[PDB]
Design a protein around this ligand. Structure first.
Ligand code: ANP
Ligand code: ANP
Lengths: 394, 394
């Protein structure tokens, strides 16, 4: 009974899951938090934050490796999937990890300093701990590599693109890829002739236009900071305004970069929390700035959803996914009502159902565009890619 | 036979026009260029760049005043219209200029340093030269003051808005206001129940959603730098990317601010020119980067046009205006074909007609949304406001 070990090595943690190759079901999940800190712990399924204070990425993965062995899993690990934050223009699909791939991931790391290096650390440790096991890399950016130049170019001088590689990349590619594949089935669409807009709404959020199975537009840019307003991220922001602020408060780009990434968005406007659940309650209670943060959030999502639709020849569906897209009955309705111009008609009873109802349609029949909720499963998408690559000869 | 003297005092020049109060026709136009420079000239209708080297804004306006007198116009000037770049949140409509208004324009000038002060200089000189004449101020931002908070707020921490006044303002308000008024007639729409998207495309470019006669969304932000990619302006740009570039080339916000405003857009990508006519020819000749600059330009316009439509309950029309919107047969068609998702159907023969055909429809009947070209006339809009205010008792 072979299993796949999926690893998401982040800047300060290591998320992992062990899925059955047969059913792709999760058999075990966990996370090593407080990495590189004098206090690092590992909580599997949440039964006991183990101890590994002052442990590097490989030690953390070693602890994890031992727990898999303590549960006689170590021997069924036939594949290992690595989530890679940024693949530059070098990766257009998932690959079997080799020395060449490592070199290439290293070449593009300057595009995502912190994140990519943590990804390499995780690969280095995984390679050390499971030498005879095939390993693959899944990049959050590859799905968006089908975008045309007109859609990925910035209006900056050409040199910045050709020399420094400044262009739109986009993220949540694995989710967008996974969710759109699922949509073809739920909506009974022909991939080769279809137009979908997927709204991945979580702490990080982005929109993606998938025309005939291909990504043709996405909201994040060279970095995860562009596009929609998010939990702590501002989203699109007039550069003139950022420049004006700097001269006004004497702050630097670093000062401002941190504010835009860690103190803005829902948190920044509400001055309460980045958690939608908290703000939804706050608004229900009469909090004015919570209502404003949510309204602004909803307004920007609708604006990008409509804008991205311009890259489609025909709009067949709008899919909501992610922690927010899958669970927020209110946000979904507000966004949808803010898109009445597109001819959307919501079925409230359907939209009211909790996420336990899985892949479901929430628009009424009279609706010109089908609306649905499709829970994302990036671990499964990664495992599926790994499984596919498991049949290759390298 | 009273006339209105319209003045656009810029950072380096003074554009002016004298319109007949009866027909609002232009009787005389001109421009004093090279202001504050050791070489300043004044070209009326283009018959003789006069001389006024080393002359301030008031001297330049004095030269202009003399030419009006030399043509016995000075005595028919019953009103003077001033174009104001930025009105902050203080101005929601055009006003009769008084000491209070001057004070208020001065209060918001920090929102547009260079520009607004030049505007005040022009008002100061006009007041000195025509004491007994009523004068009014028309702000490029007032039409957008109807935007809801959700549409004008940035995802930055609340303090920046409440304390520093950082929010979206938008520009081209006079054009958008004038053009949308004209659209109600051309399209036989009921202002009170309508949805229009106006695309002001010139060297500076912006989109605006007018719902039931009111502006509810616009593309420029706190400054003219946000939104569409323009002649020399980049348009929306991922702040993360700007931050990354800075650390990479060691440039400052000022360095980058200048590049985004003066070396980007059509000029930046084509590395040829900011003039569409030049690039259109370049592409026709096989220039690859010209074709890319134009395609990118077209792609971003379509994206914002569709996104802005989300702020409408129903899309009745899409209006093209400005130097580019009024004259570019190619760009109009490309944008429109890039919006097939909205059900637009173009009438090529109609779209082929030159601007001499004035306000005209360019979409075919089968089209779900009417498309048209409406030449903008900001001088006329200003004169009309002045005329209205001319009947008031102050
Ligand atoms: N029942 C719920 N109702 C409303 N919002 C919810 C609910 N459950 C989670 N959320 C919200 O959605 C967010 C978390 O989304 P999620 O996709 O799980 O996280 P994330 O993996 O850290 N995002 P990203 O890191 O870019 O992949 C929080 O803001 C939550 O408040
Ligand atoms: N016949 C034409 N065909 C294509 N493009 C044209 C034509 N005439 C003017 N343009 C373009 O449109 C631009 C000038 O637009 P216009 O609205 O007149 O200028 P502007 O007043 O300086 N813009 P703004 O300063 O923000 O109001 C140039 O890029 C021109 O190449």
């Amino acid at each position: 009974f072979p299993v796949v070990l999926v690893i998401n090595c982040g800047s300060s943690s290591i998320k992992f899951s062990v899925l059955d190759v047969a059913t792709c079901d999760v058999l075990m999940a966990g996370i090593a938090d407080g990495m590189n800190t004098e206090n690092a712990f590992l909580s599997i399924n949440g039964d006991k934050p183990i101890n590994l204070a002052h442990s590097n990425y490989e030690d953390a993965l070693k602890a994890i490796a031992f727990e898999l062995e303590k549960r006689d899993l170590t021997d069924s690990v036939a594949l290992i999937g690595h989530r890679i934050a940024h693949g530059g223009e070098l990766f257009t699909q998932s690959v079997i990890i080799t020395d060449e791939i490592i070199d290439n991931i290293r070449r593009v790391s300057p595009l995502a300093p912190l994140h990519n290096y943590a990804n390499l650390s995780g690969i280095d440790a995984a390679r050390h701990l499971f030498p005879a096991v095939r390993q693959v890399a899944v990049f959050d950016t590859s799905f968006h590599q089908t975008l045309a130049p007109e859609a990925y170019l910035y209006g900056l001088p050409w040199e910045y693109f050709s020399s420094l590689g400044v262009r739109r990349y986009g993220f949540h590619g694995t989710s967008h890829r996974y969710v759109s594949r699922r949509a073809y089935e739920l909506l009974d669409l022909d991939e080769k002739d279809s137009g979908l807009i997927v709204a991945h709404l979580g702490n990080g959020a982005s929109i993606c236009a998938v025309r005939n199975g291909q990504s043709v537009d996405t909201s994040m840019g060279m970095t995860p900071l562009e596009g929609l307003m998010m939990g702590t991220r501002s989203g699109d922001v007039d550069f003139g305004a950022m420049a004006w602020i700097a001269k006004e408060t004497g702050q630097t780009l670093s000062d401002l970069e941190r504010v835009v990434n860690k103190e803005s968005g829902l948190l920044g406007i509400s001055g309460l929390s980045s958690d939608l659940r908290v703000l939804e309650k706050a608004w229900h209670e009469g909090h004015e700035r919570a209502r404003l943060a949510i309204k602004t959030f909803v307004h920007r999502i609708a604006r990008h959803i409509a804008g991205h639709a311009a890259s489609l020849h025909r709009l067949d569906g709008i899919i909501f996914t992610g922690g927010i897209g899958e669970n927020s009955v209110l946000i979904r309705q507000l966004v949808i009502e803010h898109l009445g111009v597109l001819g959307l008609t919501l079925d409230v009873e359907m939209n009211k159902q909790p996420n336990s109802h899985g892949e479901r349609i929430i628009s009424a029949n009279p609706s010109q565009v089908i609306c649905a909720v499709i829970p994302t499963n990036e671990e499964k998408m990664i495992a599926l890619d790994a499984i596919h690559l498991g049949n290759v000869k390298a």
